[PDB]
Amino acid sequence: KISQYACQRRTTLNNYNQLFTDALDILAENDELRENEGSCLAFMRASSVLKSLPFPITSMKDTEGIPCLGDKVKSIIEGIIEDGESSEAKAVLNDERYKSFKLFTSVFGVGLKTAEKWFRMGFRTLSKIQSDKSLRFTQMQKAGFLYYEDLVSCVNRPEAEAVSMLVKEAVVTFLPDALVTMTGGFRRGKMTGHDVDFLITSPEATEDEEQQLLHKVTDFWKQQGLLLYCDILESTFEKFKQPSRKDAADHFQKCFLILKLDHGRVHSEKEGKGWKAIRVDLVMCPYDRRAFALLGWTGSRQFERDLRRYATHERKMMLDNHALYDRTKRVFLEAESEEEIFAHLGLDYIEPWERNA
Ligand SMILES: O=C(/C=C(\O)C(=O)O)/C=C/c1cc(C(=O)c2ccc(F)cc2)c[nH]1
Ligand code: NA
């Protein structure tokens, strides 16, 4: 029996139901843009469960016993079986508000509020936005426009590995015992990503050394002429606070960067300016919380939502990126690995490449 929870499903990148899930993903994305959180959630859960199937849906009978498939979702599956396409998702793809929101948010530094503002001003193209002499842009948006073509191109694994080398070389210069792990999509087996994310932790660093590392590493890159953009978010982490009841927020020290990646550092099968701008995120966490942070930053976003929902509703536990709290035993549960977190929750271990929910 297929569980309603992504954390009780194995979701690998061999998606047999891309015809259905690409449509459901578009409808969920439109509901996010239209601020319809409820309808968004229903389409995300339906898309997620179909991504886990080991076979393609070829008739309505194949949907029997599959959870998270309400009547609205089943009508969308029925229509795709009939025609080979979703009329509902096709209408979203041709919608002017949806097209504008996709296009504008594809710029680094542009979220739902700025995209809505520009749309209501009558803007429809990035060319008209950039060349407008009255518009005022944040420093994030200026970088987003300057390096747009590079940031809109997918980061591949040879590029992610080249970035990993840079991160590790910089980090070990200041903390030689530090552990640097590539997280996000690449850890789940993806060939591409929009960014490259890393979790950094040190077993011997002090609280001050831990705080200063991202400042030292980015100053080093600034000197090297490799830092194209940098925003460091100081930690708001509280060692003894109960985990989030909320989509949980991460309170660890982190930075959102754009790095200059020289082509010579990339060992690929394959030109231009000789470098590529890459979006990189670095997260620093205390050594004892490394398993919770790793589990949170590995994703997918749906796997994280269901993990936290399962912990609350089925185990009366509170989970976030920083800790796991047992409300019955009134104790925080310790973990040296992700395997121990799964064991605490009474879940069979799901490998990172099986978390593509
Ligand atoms: O790739 C996906 C999700 C989908 O593709 C899906 O469910 O379909 C997530 C990867 C991922 C999560 C992040 C964050 O950006 C992140 C995490 C925690 C946080 F507090 C703030 C930001 C980095 N790794
Ligand atoms: Na954006």
CATH number of residue 330's parent domain: 3.30.210.10
Q: Residue 210 in contact with residue 296, Cβ under 8 Å?
A: no
17 and 38 in one domain? yes
- According to DSSP, the residues that pair with 115 across neighbouring strands are none
What protein residues have CB closer than 5 angstroms to ion ligand 2?
Answer: 105, 110
Measured between alpha carbons, how far is 145 from 339 in angstroms, rounded to an integer?
A: 42
282 and 193 in one domain? yes
260 and 143 in one domain? no
Residue whose C-alpha is closest to residue 51's, from 37, 69, 39, 36 = 69
330 and 220 in one domain? no
Task: Report the SS3 class of residue 182.
Answer: strand
Record the tokens describing residue 269, joined without a space.
């099968």
Q: Residue 2 in contact with residue 66, Cβ under 8 Å?
A: yes
Q: Residue 322 in contact with residue 251, Cβ under 8 Å?
A: yes
Residue whose C-alpha is closest to residue 195's, from 210, 184, 211 = 184
**What are the percentages of helix, strand and coil residues in the chain, rounded to 5?**
50, 15, 35
Taking the centre of ligand 1 as the mean of its atom positions, its distance from the CA of residue 300, in whole angstroms, is 5
Task: Report the SS3 class of residue 272.
Answer: coil
Cβ-proximal residues to 78 (8 Å cutoff; 6+ apart), any chain = 60
Record the tokens describing residue 297, joined without a space.
């930053």
112 and 52 in one domain? no
Task: Report the SS3 class of residue 94.
Answer: helix
Q: Residue 126 in contact with residue 103, Cβ under 8 Å?
A: yes
295: part of which helix (H) or strand (E)? helix 290-298
Q: Residue 252 in contact with residue 293, Cβ under 8 Å?
A: yes
169 and 235 in one domain? yes
Task: Report the SS3 class of residue 132.
Answer: coil
Q: By residue range, what is the domain housing residue 125?
A: 95-153
Q: Number of folded domains in the chain?
A: 4
101 and 88 in one domain? no
Question: Determination method here?
Answer: X-ray
Give binding residues as ranges.
185-190, 194-197, 281, 296-297
Structure-token match 């047999």, residue found: 16
197, 250, 306, 320: which one is catalytic? 197
Position 162, amino acid: A
Measured between alpha carbons, how far is 185 from 200 in angstroms, rounded to an integer?
A: 17
Is residue 197 part of the annotated active site? The answer reads: yes
Taking the centre of ligand 2 as the mean of its atom positions, its distance from the CA of residue 107, in whole angstroms, is 5
State whether the beta carbon of 249 lies less than 6 angstroms from ligand 1: yes
Taking the centre of ligand 1 as the mean of its atom positions, its distance from the CA of residue 255, in whole angstroms, is 15
Q: What is the β-pairing status of strands 253-262 and 227-233?
A: antiparallel
- Ligand 1 nearest atom to the CA of residue 357, by list position: 7
Q: Residue 44 in contact with residue 70, Cβ under 8 Å?
A: no
**Gap between the terminal Cα atoms of the chain:** 17
- Ligand 1 nearest atom to the CA of residue 25, by list position: 8
243 and 352 in one domain? no
264 and 254 in one domain? yes
Give binding residues for a 2'-deoxyribonucleoside 5'-triphosphate as ranges.
185-190, 194-197, 296-297
Rg (CA), the chain: 22
214 and 123 in one domain? no
Record the tokens describing residue 244, joined without a space.
């989030």
Measured between alpha carbons, how far is 335 from 332 in angstroms, rounded to an integer?
A: 10
Structure-token match 């994703």, residue found: 299
- Ligand 1 nearest atom to the CA of residue 183, by list position: 24
Taking the centre of ligand 1 as the mean of its atom positions, its distance from the CA of residue 21, in whole angstroms, is 18
Position 100, amino acid: S
Specify the residue with its C-alpha closest to ligand 1, atom 18: 297
CA 59 centroid distance within chain = 32
Q: Which of 104, 123, 153 is the last residue before a domain boundary?
A: 153
Q: Residue 97 in contact with residue 33, Cβ under 8 Å?
A: yes
Question: Which resolution in angstroms does this entry have?
Answer: 2.6
Q: Residue 302 in contact with residue 24, Cβ under 8 Å?
A: no
Sign, CA dihedral 264-267-270-276, equals negative
The 8 Å CB, 24+ separation contacts for 304-313 are 304/248, 305/6, 305/247, 306/5, 306/6, 306/7, 306/48, 306/357, 307/5, 307/6, 307/7, 307/345, 308/244, 308/248, 309/5, 310/5, 310/7, 310/8, 310/345, 310/347, 311/345, 312/245
Record the tokens describing residue 113, joined without a space.
């509020």
> Quick one: CA torsion of 347, 308, 48, 43, rounded to 10 degrees?
150
State whether the beta carbon of 264 lies less than 6 angstroms from ligand 1: no
195, 250, 306, 320: which one is catalytic? 195
Q: Which of 94, 111, 142 is the last residue before a domain boundary?
A: 94
260: part of which helix (H) or strand (E)? strand 253-262
66 Ramachandran zone, left/alpha/beta (phi>0; psi -120 to 50): beta
